[PDB]
Amino acid sequence: MNKEHILAQKEVLTPIEYEHYVKHLFDIGEITKELYIELSSDL
Numbered sequence: 001m002n003k004e005h006i007l008a009q010k011e012v013l014t015p016i017e018y019e020h021y022v023k024h025l026f027d028i029g030e031i032t033k034e035l036y037i038e039l040s041s042d043l
Contacts, residue, residue: 003030015042 006025010018022036 006030010039 006021010021013021018039022031022033025031
């Protein structure tokens, strides 16, 4: 499984780009929206 490897990426890249990091995932279903919503701590 390559869910943890990609996760670290979103942590490195800015928060703006991360928003898309989860978009491509949906394509296969790697990470659930629950993660994109939870991790999302911007306002």
